Amino acid sequence: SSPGIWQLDCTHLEGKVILVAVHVASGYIEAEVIPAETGQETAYFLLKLAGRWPVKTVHTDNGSNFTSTTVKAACWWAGIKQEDGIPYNPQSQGVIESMNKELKKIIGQVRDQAEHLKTAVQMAVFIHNHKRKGYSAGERIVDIIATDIQ
Amino acid sequence: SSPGIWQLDCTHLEGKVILVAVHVASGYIEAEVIPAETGQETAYFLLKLAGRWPVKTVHTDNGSNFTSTTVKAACWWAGIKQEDGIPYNPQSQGVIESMNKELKKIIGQVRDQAEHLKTAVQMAVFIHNHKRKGYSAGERIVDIIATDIQ
Amino acid sequence: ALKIDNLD
Amino acid sequence: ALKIDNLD
Ligand SMILES: [Cl-]
């Protein structure tokens, strides 16, 4: 749970793939829709994420993205330590599952406002990050990182 | 120079369009490559930005994106006040031009490491945001927003 | 289309 | 291709 730790997570809807990165200490997320999970898509997403937040370590979502030399090349480029995503703490499995279920719930709630799934997913990212549970995940991530810079 | 104010900026390279959002107070940026600058592209980009940072006001980059009902709909959805980008302070034109020149310089410096321009642009976003000029823009934006929350 | 991303 | 986004 340090300021620079993120977890990748890949979930499926409408025959498409939603790739999510989770900042583990705050639960803030960034996500995108891609037609399938490849090392090249995953690598590009990580390059995007690391330009926007100070990404120190990423726990990859599966062994294909851990092995992928393209993902390792992007983590080299961006200065990220690529790690496995083994739930040594069994709580991690459950936390990710129920986030996927929350996001899919939200996507359902908005899905009728968007023609394309990618709009719905970005509406869901906005609702997740602004939800007060008291602070939101977007507030918690800035607090944590600012505390670290100081 | 409030924590929530952003400026849109659109520049061209390689026959393609790079859309950039600038957090005015810090100089932090987010950017993407699109084939052309339509209201639907600009609206989706603002929906992405506002799910990731607390975007209160956007100064649009031109009068077509100010007029566009699709951009107004995204700003309504995401709770953003859409404003014009008139440089009442003439310092503004100059700052934006100098940023586009800096990004294009960076993109040149990386361009041969990437097959696709979108990779190069995200490398340039990462270098711009991490550059110490002393704090980086990525550090300044987190400090500013954390100060505002507190 | 009555959608935020396609107002038509 | 000897590029970060296309290692071939
Ligand atoms: Cl897949």
Kindly summarize this structure in a few lines.
Chain A has 150 residues and is of the alpha/beta class.
Care to describe what's here?
The complex is a heterotetramer, with 2 copies of chain A (150 residues) and 2 copies of chain C (8 residues). Chain A has 150 residues and is α/β, with parallel strands linked by helices. Chain A has a single domain (1-150), classed as Nucleotidyltransferase, domain 5 (2-Layer Sandwich). Chain A is 51% helix and 20% strand. Chain A contains 6 helices and 5 strands, in the order βββαβααβααα. Chain A has helices at 39-52, 63-67, 69-78, 91-110, 117-130, 137-149, and strands spanning 5-13, 16-23, 28-34, 57-59, 81-83. A 5-stranded mixed sheet of chain A has the order 3-2-1-4-5, sandwiched between helices. The longest helix of chain A is centred in the last third of the chain and has 20 residues, at 91-110. Chain A is globular, with a radius of gyration of 15 Å. With 8 residues, chain C is mostly loops. Helices cover 0% and strands 0% of the residues of chain C. Chain C is globular, with a radius of gyration of 4 Å. At the A-B interface, helix 1, helix 5 and helix 6 of A face helix 1, helix 5 and helix 6 of B. Bound molecules: chloride ion (CL). Residues 17, 36-37 of chain A line the site of chloride ion. The PDB classes it as recombination/inhibitor. Keywords: protein-protein interactions, HIV, RECOMBINATION-INHIBITOR complex.
